[PDB]
Design a protein around this ligand. Sequence first.
Ligand SMILES: Nc1ncnc2c1ncn2[C@@H]1O[C@H](COP(=O)(O)O)[C@@H](O)[C@H]1O
Lengths: 427, 415
Amino acid sequence: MRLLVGNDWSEELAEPTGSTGWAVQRLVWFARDGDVLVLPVAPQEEFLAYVTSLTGTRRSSLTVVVPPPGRLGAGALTADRLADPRFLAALREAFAGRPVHEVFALWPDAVVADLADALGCPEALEGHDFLTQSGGLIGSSKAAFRALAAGAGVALPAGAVCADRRRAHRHVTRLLDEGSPVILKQDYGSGSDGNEILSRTPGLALRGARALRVLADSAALDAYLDERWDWLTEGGRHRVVVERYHPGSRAYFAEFWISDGGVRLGGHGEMRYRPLPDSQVMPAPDLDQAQLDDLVEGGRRLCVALHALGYRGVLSADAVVTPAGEVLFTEHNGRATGSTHIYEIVGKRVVGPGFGTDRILLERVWPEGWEAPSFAGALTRLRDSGHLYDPETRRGAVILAAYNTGVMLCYVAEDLEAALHREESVS
Amino acid sequence: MRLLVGNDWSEELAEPTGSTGWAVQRLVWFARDGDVLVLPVAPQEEFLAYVTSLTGTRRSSLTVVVPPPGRLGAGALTADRLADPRFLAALREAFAGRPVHEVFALWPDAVVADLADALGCPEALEGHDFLTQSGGLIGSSKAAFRALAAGAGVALPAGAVCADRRRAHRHVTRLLDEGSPVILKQDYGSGSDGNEILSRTPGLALRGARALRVLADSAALDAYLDERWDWLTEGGRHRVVVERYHPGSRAYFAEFWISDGGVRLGGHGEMRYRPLPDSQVMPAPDLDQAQLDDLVEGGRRLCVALHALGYRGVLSADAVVTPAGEVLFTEHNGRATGSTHIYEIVGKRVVGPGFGTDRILLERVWFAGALTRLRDSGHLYDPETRRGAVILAAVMLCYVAEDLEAALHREESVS
Ligand SMILES: Nc1ncnc2c1ncn2[C@@H]1O[C@H](COP(=O)(O)O)[C@@H](O)[C@H]1O
């Protein structure tokens, strides 16, 4: 029996008011026999039965525990929901006298530590003490990333970390006068919504940022900083990362599992900003040996640093390959990412040893313009067309997510072209 | 030579508008033959002569470069003073073609890395890359201390790190309802000035905070938090550390030198309240051997972690020994502290190997007049006897004697 926790982005960083309880249902992919899952919204049985049928996990051995709604409703495991005596009674009955062997959470937050303490199993949560002190936030800080990568000797685009406009203005100006565009980044921003590109020249693709600002001179920059500084600092709370932006780069990741015992490579892939990051392929294609070595060693070094200071959990090291072919690291992500269950479970467990050898994975966000009436409806159509993932041909679409009021698929194929073809058939 | 920078508390954390240039003149103690010293204010010659005669450094081999004044004046090495063309030219002249072998700064700040960049000697600054990304600030973060110590299995008072009022209220309520007093600490607070003690009971001794608030109950604390949170967070800029406070505790430090090659014990001491914090003793007295070992090994584990993440420089780990006898770490300090030149130079270089065996150092807070009268009376430090008062700054004294009782008699004499 393990306790799996489907928690969201840290309550300490942001109010999870938009959450609907859908994305964290990816937790089920990690479930193994006997496990107890804590989720904000009960998954549909059809989702559970499908996912468990593929992982080989006995569904009836699983228990799903859902807290009552909290101060922000049901969308996310807010702190008040996990402290609810009603929920705690439900949790203890789900345990049924069994010891908690391990606590696994999607996000390394103090609320998980709080839960382990309330349950009297802190020892089952690796890095518990670190987490009680809110150490897990380091996994989502770009400022922390910049310092750690630079200290560990991990290649980094030129730049700095700025707490004020005076310093920000100097570092932006240095980079712009070298003929480069610049990307500003919220310390704790999630995704490209937290970034802006600044350029002397118009017409750049908006890859990895919400907006492009064209700034002619020092005065235009003063004007920009005066207007956006509140936003860039989240109301004066956080610092801003300034770094050199490299147009037309491809985005890669190497993800690791950081335990008490040390650092272990989970997997690597490419995130396709095509022009939005709406698909990813694993493992990483089109790198030569030296670039793949740099991506993995770079990430590993970063993770060894994070391990040494006490971080425990999943760590995604994000990088770009520039048009000149240089691997530069751009951030880390301390959490179960969009990729984690895909290479770890779908790749290594469902597809098997052939994954990385004669099989790749291609996941796409449910295309806009695609519609499916329900989970069961999507599965039926896939099953009937013969495009549903078939455990003995090792080809086809794996349904990744629960019903979203469509779903989300992962195509397993010999190479990217083959998966891309599988997908056009799917309709 | 080596380039020695007498910089102050980071300009990124606070405006150093109150500095007068006096404290960073402790830089001179670290000066070795041929070095070049960057100071905000020129030291008196008599001070420079005096320090170098004790340290055995040849004074004429030294150069002091003082940047012109900057936006806050001459009191402190502000970023614009160190990027001044007039200052960079005067600095390259002081080198006169010599390569910079090592850069030593009093504070691990991004401006040091900028200066090393300007001069073309990034390789002479250990942790250069770390510092350009302002990683040195981690050495002044209590929020960082709390996580590092928790992760490193280093003992610390019960508590948490809080970003908002709701979690602070919870964690304060919990400690108070257990009957203990609580101390709130600004993430980047310099000294006790950034701390406040919360208690059910009035009259606690304010060791390490400079105000106490008596809070009867949950609504009283709502009121306090609603009133003080803006100050506690520096305008919602930083988080707040909530800790169990231990009254009547003694305060100790263990200081380490963190370089590429690893972690070296500098020294340890006590910060005495008699009744107030106006004196230091090194090495640490009145500790059992196991308490000293917990102090040093605690400090070491912590520094090993700081090392691994890239920090380079001086790191002082502060601890208290509770009335109950337990050693608990309370903060770290990444910088040359008020103690660093004392055990490292005055102790290990001036006094020699006997320091920590047959000599101890006592420093207390209450120029040629001090020197004259100390000389004429015979109380001035005598290399031949390894006893007497050392003038640490232009004044402040460090009494070298066999034990604390001998040091306190010497000071009484100096009255
Ligand atoms: N939780 C605590 N209990 C007792 N003393 C503390 C605690 N936290 C910090 N202190 C002491 O308060 C002092 C801080 O003041 P300063 O050294 O001037 O910054 C240090 O000596 C700490 O060791």
